[PDB]
Amino acid sequence: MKLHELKPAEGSRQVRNRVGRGTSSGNGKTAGRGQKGQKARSGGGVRLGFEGGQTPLFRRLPKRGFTNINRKDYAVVNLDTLNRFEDGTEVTPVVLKEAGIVKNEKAGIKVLADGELTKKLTVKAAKFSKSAQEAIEAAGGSIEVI
């Protein structure tokens, strides 16, 4: 390109709308705020979720549940993703991380049976769904609980 012939991509940049700059612009005088009231004031408006004094929805509804301190979440992997490897490959958490399939393993890799497996693989993971284990074994592979 040439510095004297620059052209942005169509629709990439827009013009800021400036309020209170004459009537014909459509945002003169009141600047789109309307006429009087609380919302027409500088810094006006009520806090989010406020309802003018009616009991807000969150106040109406009850608190529920708790968070388990020892909660364990697993990075999930499916047979479709496993199909990305070749027969006889040794699928490992390190292998998945290097492949970028599982950037964060959380508490460990758990393999699920969402897709259809088609390669014989020796999969090592923290946990396997029973269906996932059946699919891996039925495809001629094996599963080891790391």
Binding site: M1, L3, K7, P8
Partner: protein, 205 residues
């Protein structure tokens, strides 16, 4: 692609091949535009400020009582409507620099270089050597190569004499092969690069 190689004296050697990944792609106009805008913004210093009513000197007391005087009610002699009062909003020191995805940055650089090559504004010289820095000699070199417009001279690292002899010419902008920017390439109408510099560029990208 292939670009004619010239010797410093001006005579042409055999052509040399440039990596198609770098000098052979279809340039991306919008990406180039984004890079130019972003770099120009990053050049901004943005040291500018104004004094709001709280920063202006004095202005604590109420100028006169709320009611009775028949005058408009005022709260401080430094209110924005007052002559010498504070400034409503206005500039504040800030930075205008942002960053693009690395892939977009790389694509923009390749696009400008490929654009130069396609337009045949890329002149590759086998080498630029000067026993001592002499602007007259480098100007003669440009004449031999038949370059008379804005030219970006890209030199391999360490070619201090070449860089010195070239820098003072108004139409010449000197950069090292390691430190080249989309803005530099686009500003220059032609790009004069030595073969070592081109090799280093291809290595970098």
């Amino acid at each position: 692609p292939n670009v004619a190689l010239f010797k410093q004296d001006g005579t042409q050697n055999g052509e040399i091949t440039l990596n198609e990944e770098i000098f052979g792609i279809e340039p991306n106009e919008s990406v180039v535009y984004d890079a130019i805008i972003m770099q120009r913004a990053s050049l901004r210093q943005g040291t500018h400020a104004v004094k709001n009513r709280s920063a202006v000197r004095g202005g604590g007391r109420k100028p006169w009582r709320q009611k009775g005087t028949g005058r408009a009610r005022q709260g401080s002699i430094r209110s924005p409507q007052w002559r010498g009062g504070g400034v409503v909003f206005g500039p504040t020191p800030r930075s205008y620099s942002y960053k693009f995805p690395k892939k977009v940055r790389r694509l923009a650089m390749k696009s400008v270089l490929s654009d130069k090559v396609a337009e045949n504004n890329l002149v590759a010289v086998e080498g630029l050597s000067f026993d001592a820095p002499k602007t007259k000699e480098f100007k003669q070199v440009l004449a031999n190569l038949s370059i008379d417009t804005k030219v970006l001279v890209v030199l391999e690292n360490g070619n201090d004499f070449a860089a010195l002899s070239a820098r003072n010419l108004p139409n010449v902008s000197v950069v090292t092969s390691d430190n080249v920017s989309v803005l530099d390439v686009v500003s220059a109408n032609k790009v004069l690069a030595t073969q070592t510099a081109l090799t280093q560029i291809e290595e970098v990208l």
